[PDB]
Design a protein around this ligand. Structure first.
Ligand code: HEM
Ligand SMILES: *[C@@H]1O[C@H](CO)[C@@H](O[C@@H]2O[C@H](CO)[C@@H](O[C@H]3O[C@H](CO)[C@@H](O)[C@H](O)[C@@H]3O)[C@H](O)[C@H]2NC(C)=O)[C@H](O)[C@H]1NC(C)=O
Ligand SMILES: *[C@@H]1O[C@H](CO)[C@@H](O[C@@H]2O[C@H](CO)[C@@H](O[C@H]3O[C@H](CO)[C@@H](O)[C@H](O)[C@@H]3O)[C@H](O)[C@H]2NC(C)=O)[C@H](O)[C@H]1NC(C)=O
Ligand SMILES: *[C@@H]1O[C@H](CO)[C@@H](O[C@@H]2O[C@H](CO)[C@@H](O)[C@H](O)[C@H]2NC(C)=O)[C@H](O)[C@H]1NC(C)=O
Ligand SMILES: *[C@@H]1O[C@H](CO)[C@@H](O[C@H]2O[C@H](CO)[C@@H](O)[C@H](O)[C@H]2NC(C)=O)[C@H](O)[C@H]1NC(C)=O
Ligand SMILES: [Ca+2]
Length: 595
């Protein structure tokens, strides 16, 4: 049942129907709908889109037009009055490690990606939005509210370009605007291998039939691999420090270098690939180039699904886990595996877990140097710190020894993300992730905070006194009401992230419902979900059940002290054990007796 939407850009295939290997583009996962789930297609819509002209112009684009009677408040003003805070003390999540926030980004990045329009790299359209803030076509700038400090320093606005959409590119098609997802909707470790056949192949070694991924040649990490640099010459990573000119990295996903801790996580993944392919070679000396690559890839793919569903969602969705994601019962071909547009905003709850600083610890898990604790804002698109100052061991240690930030109603997003975010295209370190997130809700057309509380079958507040109760907070409910003038207009992001947390989770009623459903779907609809009979052998599954991020850390770095539960907050040296005391990934059942 797959065809109409728009023939679209999407590159045509022919399915093998018998290949035990996933396609790079995600196509052919579903035999009835080939493309359901495949990259470079439209995000899924769980509810009708809500645009100003009900087709493609966002709410806030035309000043004089209201929403339900009132004027949507400037994203940046919501940011200033409700989001930001000053005191960075007593704001850490006592029972979550920095890895908690870090793994979430890996997952989100694996599942969705709505790139900006482009149609500019020569053009003066990439400057008529930066310099003058003139709204039009794909530039929907974030104006600055009266009395904003950035007015005196940065200008009258922050450039912002609407997301890409799915038939064309430039102008339009007749119908209702739908944003694009440039990656695959299946938890298949697509951030490691790319989503297009072309990128997928540039990432491979194809000189030696060992099936290895290509690693950097100009620099090493104690004999260990580094990701490969990037060929493209305008590079933001060179920019932040024109003196050490280190370019960004090249990996299956483009945001791989937004921040030092993300690239670090990426590097651990590239390694286990090669590692997993050197071993498999030993075992089966007759296996060839493609065989090694695919089989290794298949493994790492099952890895990510396991860590995520077993270790990561249970402490995110808390006690609301079994209500949305019941125990697995097999493949279901009647389930839309496609990521929905709202998931990409619901999942952004993490943004309020990013802490103000990042640390580097030596072996005794102590301060590594004199400038070991650096401000979060000096690490965006920073590769020199890795390559030219320490390696990745110091950074991985921090991920385990330090903590995550705890969403606090009186303290939402770090000022490191709200005032000093760096953007790949521009130069200053002065953007606001909060205003961008909010502006993007409207860009993508998301419906109000209530339409969603309704979608999830929750009470819908119409009065100040009512909003006080749901958020269980007066000040907040009042500020939220002074700006939005009706609970019907609270942007789902700031809206969803304002409800108090659920028992043992880290998100509330409306986010738990939105994340819950989604994850249930990608699992129930993936023909290659590791627990799905036939994908792996009964004996293979038994061996994968033991994987643990901890081990991943041991077989891939020179760390020898790691916690058993890398996600909860552990303290060194008590909660740390020696690597030799940690279960290994026994690849024995991956041997093949010809006779
Ligand atoms: C800096 C940034 C982060 C911290 C170092 C950070 C972190 C996260 C986490 C931990 C997420 C999930 C649990 C998460 C989700 C999504 N992000 Fe955020 N992210 C940083 C920076 C950015 C920037 C800049 C953007 C672009 C926003 C835009 O709309 O232009 C960004 C996006 C997202 C995003 C949207 C996915 C998409 O399809 O584009 C998440 C789902 N992150 N981030
Ligand atoms: C910090 O968070 C930790 C993770 O939630 C928590 O430890 C976990 O506590 C839960 C019970 O709340 C238990 O989790 C698992 O227990 C049963 C076995 O009896 C499993 O079959 C279930 O899947 C369930 O998830 C464990 O006791 C433990 N889990 C892990 C992985 O360590 C800590 O208690 C929290 N620390 C503080 C101070 O609150
Ligand atoms: C841009 O990246 C540079 C890395 O190439 C970085 O400079 C490097 O780091 C420090 C500079 O403070 C120097 O390291 C230390 O060397 C010895 C110890 O071995 C000390 O005696 C020195 O005082 C110094 O602290 C490196 O030598 C230096 N390398 C080079 C080529 O400059 C810059 O700090 C970065 N600049 C910015 C603005 O971020
Ligand atoms: C592709 O794989 C080959 C085979 O392992 C790599 O060749 C090795 O290169 C390193 C340093 O250049 C040395 O250990 C040897 O010269 C090679 N080893 C062997 C066993 O041949 C090659 O570097 C890889 N290419 C890329 C881009 O990653
Ligand atoms: C296969 O997955 C579908 C996807 O939802 C399941 O659909 C059931 O529940 C849906 C609402 O959540 C409803 O649309 C349907 O009434 C219902 N489907 C049927 C056939 O009753 C479906 O139950 C799953 N199939 C099996 C055998 O579990
Ligand atoms: Ca994916």
């Amino acid at each position: 049942s797959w065809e109409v939407g728009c023939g679209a850009p999407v590159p045509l295939v022919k399915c093998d129907e018998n290949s035990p290997y996933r396609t790079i583009t995600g196509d052919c996962n579903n035999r009835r709908s080939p493309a359901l789930g495949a990259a470079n297609r439209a995000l899924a819509r769980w509810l009708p889109a809500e645009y100003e002209d009900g087709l493609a112009l966002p709410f806030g684009w035309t000043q004089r037009k209201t929403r339900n009677g009132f004027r949507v408040p400037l994203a940046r003003e919501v940011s200033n009055k409700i989001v930001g805070y000053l005191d960075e003390e007593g704001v850490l999540d006592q029972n979550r490690s920095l890895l908690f926030m870090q793994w979430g980004q890996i997952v989100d990045h694996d599942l969705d990606f709505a790139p900006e329009t482009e149609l500019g790299s020569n053009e003066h359209s990439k400057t008529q939005c930066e310099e003058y803030c003139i709204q039009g076509d794909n530039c929907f700038p974030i104006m600055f509210p009266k009395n904003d400090p950035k007015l005196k320093t940065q200008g009258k606005c922050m450039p912002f370009f609407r997301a890409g959409f799915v038939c064309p590119t430039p102008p339009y098609q007749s119908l209702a605007r739908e944003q694009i997802n440039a990656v695959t909707s299946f938890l298949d470790a697509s951030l490691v291998y790319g989503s297009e056949p072309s990128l997928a192949s540039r990432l491979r070694n194809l000189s030696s039939p060992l099936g290895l991924m290509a690693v950097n040649q100009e620099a090493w990490d104690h004999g260990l691999a580094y990701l490969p640099f990037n060929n493209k010459k305008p590079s933001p990573c060179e920019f932040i420090n024109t003196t050490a000119r280190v370019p960004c990295f090249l990996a299956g996903d483009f945001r791989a270098s937004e921040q030092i801790l993300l690239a670090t996580a990426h590097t651990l993944l590239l390694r286990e690939h090669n590692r997993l392919a050197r071993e498999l070679k030993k075992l089966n000396p007759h296996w060839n180039g493609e065989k090694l690559y695919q089989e290794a890839r298949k493994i790492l793919g099952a890895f990510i699904q396991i860590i995520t569903f077993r270790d990561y969602l249970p402490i995110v969705l808390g006690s609301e886990m079994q209500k949305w994601i019941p125990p697995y019962q097999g493949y279901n071909n009647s389930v839309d595996p496609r990521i929905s547009n709202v998931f990409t905003f619901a999942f952004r709850f993490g943004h309020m877990e990013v802490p103000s600083t990042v640390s580097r610890l030596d072996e005794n898990y102590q301060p590594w140097g004199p400038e070991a604790e650096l401000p979060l804002h000096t690490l965006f698109f920073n590769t020199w710190r890795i390559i030219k100052d320490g390696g990745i061991d110091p950074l991985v240690r921090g991920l385990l020894a330090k903590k995550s930030k705890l969403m606090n109603q009186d303290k939402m997003v770090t000022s490191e993300l709200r005032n000093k975010l760096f953007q790949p295209t521009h130069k200053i370190h002065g953007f606001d992730l909060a205003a961008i997130n909010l502006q993007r809700c409207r860009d993508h057309g998301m419906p109000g905070y209530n339409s969603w509380r309704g979608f999830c079958g929750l009470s819908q507040p119409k009065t100040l006194k009512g909003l006080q109760t749901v958020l269980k907070n007066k000040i907040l409910a009042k500020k939220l009401m002074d700006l939005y003038k009706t609970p019907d207009n609270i942007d789902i992001w700031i809206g969803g992230n304002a409800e108090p947390m659920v028992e043992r989770g880290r998100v509330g009623p409306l986010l738990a419902c939105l994340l819950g459903r989604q994850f249930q779907q990608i699992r129930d609809g993936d023909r290659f979900w590791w627990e799905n009979p036939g994908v792996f052998t009964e004996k293979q599954r038994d061996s994968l059940q033991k994987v643990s991020f901890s081990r991943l850390i041991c077989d891939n770095t020179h760390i020898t002290k790691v916690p058993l539960h890398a996600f909860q907050a552990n303290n060194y040296p008590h909660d740390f054990v020696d690597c030799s005391t940690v279960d290994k990934l026994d690849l024995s059942p991956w041997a093949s007796r010809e006779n």
